[PDB]
DNA sequence: AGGCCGCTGCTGCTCAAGAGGGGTTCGCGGGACGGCATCGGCCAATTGGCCCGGTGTGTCGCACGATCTGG
């Protein structure tokens, strides 16, 4: 129903495609970089 | 009433059924082709026989004869 309705401005998929189009365009600068600051100033069981 | 800080239970990983149609294989034969393999001659060639013809040098078969040891 959500892909007939407004099928244009976003792209689904399932299996190990999707993973693998995930893992294509993934920045894993940014996401460290979040971590890293997360970790300075996040406490609890989320720093873990 | 949602977010969040712990508890507490639960789970997981590891060590001891036919029928037709068609291209392809191979498998027998099947013989044809070409080829190399096998058998009377054959004469004038190196080695090796097989000797003449000379002596000599050196072993062996026996004669005269001296020395020596045993009999």
Redesign the pocket.
Known sequence: ELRDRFGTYFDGSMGAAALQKRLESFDLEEEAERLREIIRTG????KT
């Open positions: 406490k609890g069981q989320k």
